Structures are given as C-alpha cells and as structure tokens.
C-alpha cells in the first residue's frame, strides 16, 4: 500500500516534467528557425539598403 | 564595503562577457541536451521504483 | 538579350492567362485569381523589359 | 545556472533579434504592403473581367 | 552563475565543433549498419528463448 | 546521427534554387486534372465516334 | 541526332495511337486515357525537338 | 506458460524493431537521392547561372 | 578639435584614394556577387522555416 | 567604410585575376563533364528508389 | 547627368501620386497620406534639381 501510494505520486511528477521538456525541445527547433530568419533578414536589409558606404 | 562593490562590478562585467559570448543557436540546443540528460536519470530511478513495487 | 527576355516573359504571361481561364472554367475561383495575379506579374516584368529595350 | 533559465535567456534574445529586424525594415523604408494592396486590387478587376467573359 | 554559464558556452561550442566536423550522411549510414547488427543480435536472442520454450 | 539532421542538410542544400513551392504546386495540380481528364474524354469519344 | 530523337518519338507516338483507337473501337471507356496520355507526352517531346531541330 | 508469454512479448519487440529499421533504410535512401538531386541542381545553377569562367 | 579635423582630412584622403582605385567593371560585378551570396543564406533560413511549418 | 571599400576592391581585383587566368572553354568542357557525372549519380539514386518501391 | 536625376524624380513623383489615388479609391486613408508625403519630398528635390540645372 505504501509503495503504490508513493510510486503513483512520482509518476504524476515525471509526467509533468516530460510535458515540460518536450515543450522546450519543440520550441528549441522553431526558435532556431526564427533566429536564423531574423539574422538573415537584418543582413539583407542592410546590404540591399543604400545607407552607408 | 567598497571592496564588495568593486567585486560586484567585476562579476557584473564577467557575467556580461559570458552572456555576450553566447550564440543562441548552440546554447538553446545545449540547454535541451541538459534537460534530456537529467530526465534519463530520473527515469532510471522510477524504473527501480516500479520494479520494487512489483 | 533584352529582346529575348521581353518576348519570353510575354509568352509566360499568356501561358498563365490560359491557366487562369481553364481554372475558371473548371470552377475553381482561387486558382483563377492567383493565375491572373501571376499573369499580371509576368506582364509587369515584360513591361519593364519593353521600356528597357 | 539552471537549463530553463539559460533557455529563457536565449529565447528573449532571439525574440529581440526578430523585433530588431522588423524595426530595421520599417526604418529602412517598408515596401511589403503598398505593392501587395495594388496587386490585389488590379488582380481583382482582372478576375471580374475574366469571369464576365 | 559565472562558471555555470561558462560551462554551458564551452559545452555548446565543443558540440558545435563536433557537429561541424562530422558528415551526417556517413554517420547515418554507419548508424543503420549498427541498428542492423543489433537487429541480428535480437533475432538470435529471440531464437534462444524460443529454443528454451520448446 | 539524426535522420532529421540529414534531412535538414538536404533541405538547406536543395533550396538556393528557390523552392518556395508557389510555382510547382499550382502547376502540377491543374495540369494533371485537365490533362488526364481530357485524356478520358478524348479516348471515350474516339471509342464511340470512329467506328 | 535531334532529327533521330524527333523521329523516334513520332514512331513511339503511333505505337500508342493504335492502342488508344483500339480501346475506342471496342467501346471501352477506361483504357484509352492511358494510351492517349502517352501519345500526347511523346508529341510534346517531339514538338520540343522540332523547335530545337 | 511463462516462457511462451515472455517469448511472445520479445517477438513483438523484434517485429517492431525490424519494421522501424526497414523504415529508416527506406528514408535514408530517399534522402541520399534528394541530396544527389540538389548537388546536380547546383552544378547546373553554376554552369548555366550568371557570369564567370 | 584640430586633432579630429586632421583625422578627418586623413580619412577623406584615404577614402578618395580607395574610390579612385575602383574599376567599375570589377566592382559592379563584385557587388552583385555579394548580393547573391547574401540571398543564398536568407534562402536557407526560409528553407528551415518552411520545413518547420510542415 | 574605408576598409569595407578596400575589401571590395581587393576581392574584385582577385576575382578578375582568376577570370583572366582561366580559359572558359576548358572550364565549360570540364563543367559539362561534371554535370554528366552528377546526372549518372542521380540515375543510380532514382534506380534505388524504384527498387525500394518495387 | 543632373537633368537625368531631375527627370527621373519627376516620374517617381507621378508614380507615388498614382499610388495615393489608387489607395484613396480602395478605402485606405493611411497609405495615401504617406504616398502624398513621399511625392512632396521628391517634388521638392525635383525643384532644387531644376534650379541647379
Ligand atoms: N555575375 C554573376 N552573376 C550571377 N552569379 C554569379 C556571378 N558571378 C558568380 N556567380 C555565382 O553564381 C551564383 C549566383 O547566386 P544565386 O543565388 O544562385 O543566383 P540567384 O540569386 O539569381 O538564384 C553565386 O553563388 C556565385 O558564386
């Protein structure tokens, strides 16, 4: 009875952490895409812009 | 206290330096690695617990 | 080369005109609308080359 | 020193870099709307003439 | 925090140098070969448990 | 080791050529529709005309 | 060589032309499209070779 | 009974493993093909691109 | 401020020198190269974005 | 700006020296040979995907 | 060379005017204002160019 009560508590917390890590890894990918896009956008706007020498 | 404040300024400068040295691409990915490396270890503890319950 | 570019773009505009009318006949409004936008875009490119020529 | 704090710090950085690129474009001389609206109106009347005939 | 951030930057940079140097087609090929080796080992293991069942 | 990273390298390398897919997508769809559609009609009218 | 490729496709076009008319001489419905499509593709290729030639 | 249900579960794991590896092999080869297609496209973009040697 | 003005004169002279050293034929073409080299990189970012959307 | 302009002049001149030294007929010939090699590699790749389909 | 830029700023001004009109004909009171302002700037420039010419 003690084992079952405790091992179930641990499963809820593991499940929450699994939701949490997977949230970060899917965000990691799309954020890297967003970052690369932003970097590239800035470089092209500066280069094709007539400002500066 | 001027000593501590000097130390604060030095730590702040070093903190800013290592923040500036970050590249989001590498670091964001590295952070995820750490999350997965930590999760594996917790899974192994839960693995043991389930076996003991059985 | 400018003469060739002009003619080629005009020909592409006509191909997309045909596609628009065929899409319209099939009953798909959206492809007809987009194809007419493509037709206009290629006409505009040809126009630019016309002036340049 | 936690993984999540590192993740949030880089996330905010990336979002700022997106915003910076956006702002840079607006300051440079935005041009991704004034043309779209024209194309839209022009293709609009083109669609009407095509549908009519 | 200073050295914890430093560690994250260093590991991120080292892993990027590894990512750069390797060619993922050769690694993917090698990986499929290794998965096929493991598959054969599991087939043998399965045969052994079937043999004991019999 | 990632099959996905192998895909991403390919996705990158096969992109400069400009593959937004505004062109190809539209084109093929309508083409196959009216193309094979016209082939059916033609074939069936020839089968019931030329005899 | 361009002449030869053009001619080869003309011959191949007749090979699929007879099969298309054959299905249509039996009052079949769903065979003709296959042979007709093949003939159509070959005559488009021959057209390109004609221009080239 | 214990050996049969054990072996059955292990056999199920073997089947799943083999199916996933078969998938991986299929995907690996189509990626090789798309990579080689991209390389070919690049060489045409080079030779038949802009100006140079 | 005479120091800064001396520096201005020197930079102006060097700017004029490197402008005079340009040959339109080479430089105009080189500029286009830079445009295409930049565009390739942006295409690769958009390539990733499209894949992520899918 | 001074050194940015300098870089553009230097790269333009270096590329012109390369353009001068090479003979585009030999390069065009070599290029067609390389395109033909790539074509064969794609043919083999196509055969492999057909084989897997089959 | 001065005459050239003069005559070209004139055409750009006419383009911006036409865009302002077209925007006002579609119910957009924001783009037309900026377009009129850009035309005014370019017409000032044309005036100065005319004087110096
Ligand atoms: N004068 C030139 N015009 C076009 N391309 C050039 C020229 N000189 C060299 N190149 C090469 O051709 C490629 C053209 O870039 P690319 O992005 O493929 O063109 P586009 O942007 O028109 O698709 C570059 O990678 C460059 O190395």
- F43: its two tokens: 């074939």
- Chains in touch with J (≥3 Cβ pairs < 8 A): A, H, I
SS (H, E, C) K2-52: HHHHHHHHHHHHHHHHHHHHHHHCCCCCCHHHHHHHHHHHHHHHHHHHHHH
The 3-state DSSP class for residue A45 equals helix
Please check whether residue C2 is in contact with residue C52, taking contact to mean a CB–CB distance below 8 angstroms. Answer: yes
* Residue nearest atom 24 in ligand 1 by C-alpha distance: I36
Residue located via tokens 């790749």 = J45
Going by C-beta distance under 8 Å and a sequence separation of 6 or more, which residues neighbour residue A5?
none
CA–centroid distance for C36 within its chain: 7
Q: How far is residue K32's CA from residue K25's CA, in Å, rounded to a whole number?
A: 10
Question: Which residues are near ligand 1 (CB < 6 Å)?
Answer: F 16; H 45, 49-52; I 29, 32-33, 36, 39-40
Task: Using alpha carbons only, give the angle J29, J33, J34 rounded to the nearest 5 degrees.
Answer: 115
- Ligand 1 centre and the CA of B6: distance in Å? 54
Going by C-beta distance under 8 Å and a sequence separation of 6 or more, which residues neighbour residue I29?
H51, J12, J15
> Does any CB of chain E come closer than 8 Å to the CB of residue H11?
yes
Q: Looking at CA atoms only, how far is residue D26 from chain A in angstroms? A: 10
- CB pairs under 8 A, 24+ apart, for I37-40? I38/A43, I38/A44, I38/A47, I38/A48, I39/A44, I40/F16
Q: Looking at CA atoms only, how far is residue A24 from chain I in angstroms? A: 15
CB atoms within 10 A of CB I46: 18
CA–centroid distance for E16 within its chain: 17
Nearest to E9 by CA among B25, D18, F33: B25
Nearest to H37 by CA among A51, J46, C9: J46
Q: How far is residue I25's CA from residue I23's CA, in Å, rounded to a whole number?
A: 6
Query: Exposure pattern of K8-41 as b/e (b: 16+ CB <10 Å)?
Result: ebbebbeebbebbebbeeeebeebbeebbebbee
- Ligand 1 centre and the CA of I37: distance in Å? 7
Q: 3-state DSSP: chain I helix, strand, coil percent, rounded to 5?
A: 95, 0, 5
Q: How far is residue C6's CA from residue C53's CA, in Å, rounded to a whole number?
A: 8
Q: Which helix (H) or strand (E) holds C31?
A: helix C29-52
- C2: its two tokens: 């400018």
Please judge whether G37 and F50 are an interchain contact, meaning their C-beta atoms are less than 8 angstroms apart.
Answer: no
CA-based torsion, H30, E23, J41, F26: positive or negative: positive
A25: phi then psi, degrees, rounded to nearest 5: -70, -35
**Resolution (in Å) of the shown entry?**
3.8
Going by C-beta distance under 8 Å and a sequence separation of 6 or more, which residues neighbour residue E5?
B15, B18, B19, B22, D1, D6
Residue located via tokens 């914890």 = E4
- CB pairs under 8 A, 24+ apart, for K18-22? K19/D34, K19/D38, K22/D38, K22/D41
Residue located via tokens 């799309």 = A30
Please check whether residue I48 is in contact with residue A33, taking contact to mean a CB–CB distance below 8 angstroms. Answer: yes
> Does any CB of chain E come closer than 8 Å to the CB of residue F12?
no
Please judge whether F40 and G32 are an interchain contact, meaning their C-beta atoms are less than 8 angstroms apart.
Answer: yes
Q: Where are the beta strands (DSSP E) in J6-51?
A: none
Residue located via tokens 């730590």 = B11
Query: Exposure pattern of G2-15 as b/e (b: 16+ CB <10 Å)?
Result: eeeebeebeebbee
- B25: its two tokens: 């691409």
Please check whether residue B53 is in contact with residue A4, taking contact to mean a CB–CB distance below 8 angstroms. Answer: yes
- Chains in touch with A (≥3 Cβ pairs < 8 A): B, D, I, J
Which of F12, F16, F19, F23 should be mutated for ligand 1, with most atoms under 8 A from CB?
A: F16
């Amino acid at each position: 009875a003690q084992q079952r009560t405790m091992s179930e508590n641990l499963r809820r917390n593991l499940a929450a952490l699994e939701a949490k890590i997977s949230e970060a890894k899917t965000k990691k990918n799309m954020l890297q895409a967003r970052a690369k896009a932003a970097k590239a956008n800035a470089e092209l706007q500066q280069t094709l812009g007539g400002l500066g020498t | 206290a001027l000593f501590d404040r000097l130390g604060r300024v030095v730590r702040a400068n070093l903190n800013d330096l290592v923040s500036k040295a970050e590249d989001p691409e590498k670091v964001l990915e590295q952070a995820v690695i750490d999350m997965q490396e930590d999760l594996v270890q917790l899974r192994q503890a839960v693995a043991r617990t389930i076996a003991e319950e059985k | 080369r400018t003469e060739q570019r002009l003619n080629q773009d005009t020909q592409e505009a006509k191909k997309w005109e045909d596609r628009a009318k065929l899409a319209l006949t099939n009953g798909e409004e959206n492809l007809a609308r987009e194809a007419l936008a493509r037709k206009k875009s290629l006409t505009d490119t040809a126009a630019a080359y016309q002036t340049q020529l | 020193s936690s993984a999540t704090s590192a993740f949030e710090r880089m996330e905010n950085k990336v979002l700022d870099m997106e915003a910076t690129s956006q702002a840079a474009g607006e300051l440079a001389g935005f041009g991704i709307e004034n043309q779209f609206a024209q194309l839209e109106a022009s293709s609009g009347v083109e669609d009407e003439l095509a549908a009519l005939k």
